[PDB]
């Protein structure tokens, strides 16, 4: 459950 | 009269020390720089004209030369970083900030535009514009009871310039400048012009592209509902930035994610995840991945809104990059979900499209998909249904591919492949 | 975009 940005 | 002049003629007029001859030559320069057919920016720079134009900005006595010089300098500042730098190096910034106070609206607007080009170059010029005190005079021009009384072109230019003062990272704009600007941005996000809305959303997208603390500044101003409304718009130029902003916000805390959910966002995703523009589908699936990365009650709202079949859909058929985001969304869901939620996901048909994507030529998506199979098996282990899942995976062509992958370049691939085979097959 | 030319008015 690892959030990842852009 | 002022059409198709040589640079040599512009120089002769500008060096005349006849204010009118200077005005004509400045206009000739502006017309040169206004042609779309490869304007001679570098020739104008090399002729030494920028300082001259800059000093013409301060001639209150002669408003036309102020305007013509502003427009010329605007078009130079619209070029490469090096061309923008020539303008800044000529002292243009404080001179444009003075012109913001011009009683002539066309001159004021041109100064706004120029500062927008300067700030849009990057963080350093953005911060230099801010240090020279541009924000107060800019916001003052929008200090009216009703934005609708301002000319359309003018409001649009101001909005755009403000968005460039919010733009760029490494570093992001100063926190105090962001706080000063945000209340005005929130007002522009409620204006009815499509272009003002698009640029307002772009600004918000920029301000939300950072750590949780930056997101919090925005989310705390109460804009999430208005963003979600804008997410529902017809105009793709509005939806694109609104979706980017919503996506940024859900990269934050689960409490920040909940604001988006509470504002009704998930009800738009059936359209977004089937949108004909590749980029909207990609970004909406990316957004979903960061919602599936949340709490189980948040995953449950994804379920209740009917979005799992849409994820199955995007996994089954989309641009590859979208399918990659869908894989992430599934891995996140399987990683955080209850057993019941993972069972539902399988009942919706996730297994075949996941397995189809193991034929991909992208080592990352394979690792993501393999993780997801593992988590699904883990949920089957807790139900004693490892056999049924094994059969499903075997029946749609899955076992073949997982086997093959025991003999793959990447380490994690071959490892997780062999672990699945040996434990379940 | 980041920057914009003014073309006519």
Numbering used by the authors:
A (entry chain B): 1 to 6
B (entry chain A): 72 to 496
C (entry chain C): 1 to 9
From the paper:
Importin‐α is critical for successful nuclear import as it recognizes and binds to cargo proteins bearing a classical nuclear localization signal (NLS), which facilitates their transport from the cytoplasm into the nucleus. Importin‐α possesses an α‐solenoid tertiary structure characterized by a deep concave surface ideal for NLS‐cargo binding (Fournier et al. 2013). Notably, the twist causes the concave surface to become deeper at the N‐ and C‐termini, resulting in what is commonly known as the major (ARMs 2–4) and minor (ARMs 6–8) NLS‐binding grooves, respectively. In this study, we describe a combined computational and biophysical approach to design TAF8 NLS analogs, with zero net charge, and test their ability to target importin‐α.
To validate the computational modeling design, the analogs were co‐crystallized with importin‐α, and their structures were experimentally determined by X‐ray crystallography. The crystal structures had the same space groups as the original TAF8 NLS/importin‐α complex and every amino acid was resolved for all analogs bound at the major groove. Accordingly, the analogs bury an average surface area of 629.6 ± 21.2 Å2 in the major groove.
